Amino acid sequence: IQRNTLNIDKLKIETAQELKNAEIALRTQKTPPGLQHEYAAPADYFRILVQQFEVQLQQYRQQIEELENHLATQANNSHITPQDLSMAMQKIYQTFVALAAQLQSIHENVKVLKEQYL
Amino acid sequence: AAAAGGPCVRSSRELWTILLGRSALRELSQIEAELNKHWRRLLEGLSYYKPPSPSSAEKVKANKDVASPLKELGLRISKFLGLDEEQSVQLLQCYLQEDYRGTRDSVKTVLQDERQSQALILKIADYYYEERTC
Amino acid sequence: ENGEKITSLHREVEKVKLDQKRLDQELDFILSQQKELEDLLSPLEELVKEQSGTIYLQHADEEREKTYKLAENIDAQLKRMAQDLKDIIEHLNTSGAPADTSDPLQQICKILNAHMDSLQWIDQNSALLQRKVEEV
Amino acid sequence: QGEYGVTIAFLRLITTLVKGQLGSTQSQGLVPCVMFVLKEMLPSYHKWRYNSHGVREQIGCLILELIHAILNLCHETDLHSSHTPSLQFLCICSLAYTEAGQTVINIMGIGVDTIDMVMAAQPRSDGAEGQGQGQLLIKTVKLAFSVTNNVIRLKPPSNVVSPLEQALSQHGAHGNNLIAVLAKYIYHKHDPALPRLAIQLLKRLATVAPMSVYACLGNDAAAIRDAFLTRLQSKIEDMRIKVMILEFLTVAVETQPGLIELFLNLEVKDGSDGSKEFSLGMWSCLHAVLELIDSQQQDRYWCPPLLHRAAIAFLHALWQDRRDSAMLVLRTKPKFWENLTSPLFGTLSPPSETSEPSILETCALIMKIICLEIYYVVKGSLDQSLKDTLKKFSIEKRFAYWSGYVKSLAVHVAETEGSSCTSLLEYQMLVSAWRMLLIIATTHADIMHLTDSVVRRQLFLDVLDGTKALLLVPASVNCLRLGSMKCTLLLILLRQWKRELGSVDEILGPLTEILEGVLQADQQLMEKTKAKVFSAFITVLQMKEMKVSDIPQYSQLVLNVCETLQEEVIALFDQTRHSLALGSATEDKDSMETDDCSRSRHRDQRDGVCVLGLHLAKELCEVDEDGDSWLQVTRRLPILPTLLTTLEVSLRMKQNLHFTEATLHLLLTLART
Amino acid sequence: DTEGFGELLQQAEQLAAETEGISELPHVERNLQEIQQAGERLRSRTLTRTSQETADVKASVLLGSRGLDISHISQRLESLSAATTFEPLEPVKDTD
Amino acid sequence: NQTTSVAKIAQYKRKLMDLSHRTLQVLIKQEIQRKSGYAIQADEEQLRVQLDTIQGELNAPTQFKGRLNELMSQIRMQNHFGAVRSEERYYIDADLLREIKQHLKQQQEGLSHLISIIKDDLEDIKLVEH
Fold it and tell me: What one-character-per-residue DSSP string does A51-63 give?
């Protein structure tokens, strides 16, 4: 049910910005042609849409390069050993301890800002 | 087309490639048979290819075995080349069997993008000129 | 013990029987917004078809139609390539799993993936929180 | 000036002087002329002034005729003289490692549409020898592909990709993909040599490029397939294009996965029971392969054997490389096994007549497909048309026919070594396939219908004679290799049929003659044959109670075995003494990699020549009831002292366990008399 | 007892799905040698911000405030890297 | 009802895709109509140069569409051969599995506290920002 919450409020933001896109089409048609050159918003929309394509193409490049990492090692994988498992648990735990140590070094600064301002 | 067992009417360039001995054909009887079959194209010469006719246009429209976009391009080829509507649909089918460097389904989008439809008409004109030459 | 455990479990259930009823109201609100968007678009779609009878008169009209039709082509390639990528990832994950999910080794390896995801969120959001602590 | 009358004369002169040095040491004398053509002329001639059209194309044609002449010089291999690089090797390295190579790439990169355009422009209808500019350009581009196909064939084996091989796989960001241009030569109709030299290069990029040939075709890939398939089907096409297409698709099973899926074109369906049906879709290559093998069209269109060979080689790779989604869709075809096996029901000329070697390969490859199908399809699910086809093969006695043929072919090889016998590889292929078929026909005898003990006894004796003929030629590495392979078959047939070989007399004679030829040949090659022959003798002596009266030349057999044992036990002794001088080896307990060489042979193995010699000496001692025959051999040789001195070290070291036990077994048998 | 890892995995999928800033596309179920690499490809960024000379110390302050000792879990993860579990030498397999 | 919400979401995302493509096909035509008979502008040639560049990367045979068809080739082969590799079932002791479950539990409860603290701190800092 919580996985539905996050999918719903994402889709609500998506739907509310598309209502706002279609309001630019409703305002452009309602603007008299002798003033339609003063209404920048269609060109601001097309610039934002191209910037969204440029960001999507970076995300879709990263996931292809992560899929090509995964298949290049899974092609060599021939069994899981107990040693691969122990070395996975050990590395994830050392990354966990290191990130807890970083978070302490931020959370204490958050307290110092909080006790300085409230 | 290539699932209907009709007698395909060879290009003059297929015939040329055979008479040059550059094909794998080595039997006297197979060259004799294809000459006794095609000597009327050799005697009709350039006049084997004919001007447009309302009777050819009506047959091309009435035919059920040719998909509509190949009739509609065939009638555009007919106007562009000054060529008979049945022979224009034949020439289009020969080009789409011999020299179209695409899949049988990229033919659908090349018949829906008008810039690609125009570029295909121009390649079929060069194919018509090699055919007449052959 | 069972009496207080069952009395807790029914409160735990009736909470989730309110949260689902929030999501059905937000879903049928989104359906209302998508309906208003359609009754706003449908008059624009038809008035723009009438105005599509205007004759282009310069090469700048031709090149302009090609430019904005290139965005309509890129949109219809990116929103495809997203589904083409999605089917790759859903077919990869559903074939990297051997046919018995009762296995402790599969269950540990999937716990270790979700721990690695949790850590990759902790890296990124620590590297956001520290920047707000550098922006105040 | 822009005009090249002396350059055109010079390139013709050097081309004639090189074509005139087939058979003399003066080849060094043209190196500066050839290096000037490779360095100064080849990378620059497209940058020169020209006053007349086609002269640039004739200079490129004449440079590539010189290079194609150098790259088809033969070597008479005097392996023992000088430290000087050959004119061919200098040409190969100059083309592999410099801009000379990139120029040959740029000439292949001209593309078919440019040739088609030049031929459509020409003011002529060129006669067959007329050097019109498009037929000249086709000569230049064919020579460029031919040069590249010789450079990549004559590069020494090395773990390095040369810039020529790298520039054949690299994607120039603002250029045509070269592999897509190489593949687009499939559209060229005006000369059937051009697409063959392009497909021959693609068949090698498929085995050497670090990226998929299928991805390198991208949006063209399916159209290029539809074109390759149309030429494979076409009933007017050069047979040698169809052979090169099928052999490019064989290699695509071995090394190019996305390309072989694209050409297989399997159309899936949803089965009622949740299973995926597969079917041959409208562009499957297998529709054309199934026409080429149909007996009921070979009665109408003679499929020439090099093309049937290529269609069967493609089917053999699909069974080798486990393409089960294709094999399932072939197993379900009506008459597949009746048509596929039809050459195995022919009758060949004797090996002393000029048989076509493509037919010998065809039969060897069909035998390999039958082997792989019966091995993978565990005793049940095998097709019924195959089950009655194997039954037909037994009923027609085809076992005894192919037995007599793989016997006479092995005699003919022993009768023709010392001539340059050109078909030896195809002969080795047929002998390898017949070995595989027979080891499956003992273990799956019920499925092979190989249950007549008279036919089994013939198959054994034809393998025995057909091994003897290859092991009585001790100077021939070819006969020794084939003979050690058949001796491996002989030993399996012996042990699995040791109840039906109802006389011993016929086996012992040819085994002594095999042993004596296996003692006249190289110790290091034939170790892995001495063991097989001793293992055969032990197995033969174990079939029946025998006396010294019953073993042909017993007193020489005991000598030959005792002298071989004294080679082996001295070599084991010093192997056990060098492990006593090389202190501290480590327990290197990870290395999961596959069959290469030179890691040292432990002579203490159960299959070892030493250990099999000790057990053969024991079985031979258990036949000499008074011991007086064996004692006349050990009154020659010091073999007891030698065995005891190696036993003494083996016991002190806790080393050589199989030898230590086998030595005590021989001594315990001797202590009875 | 018999109450296995699937109960803990059901909570692991929650901790990921309540940190998902939901994408347009799904995530990849990495194999174990990509998991080992994803750990170290991340630790090699954390240890350019925090020195390891203070790491387990600051982690023990932060997580000890929630009832976790790091020392007992590290000494367990050392035993879980020394514990030679046994070899099941009996299964007949293969097709070659 | 959760499963019915997943089905509602999967319908409503596809309906937003219809409506967004329809907004785009309205705005495109309104902009061509708004600028009809005017020369190409600097905003409009910039927009074209970005779109021509993006269409370049989407057609490039070693970008996205090549790689996505090679990934689908690799996965198919790996699955076709992987189902013929031979399971070596390492049986793990019940108490080594008991310790590994407790390690993963304490680490996951620890990760849950870090994911609290980052959400807690990321709403406290928003209350200093206002």
Answer: HHHHHHHHHHHHH
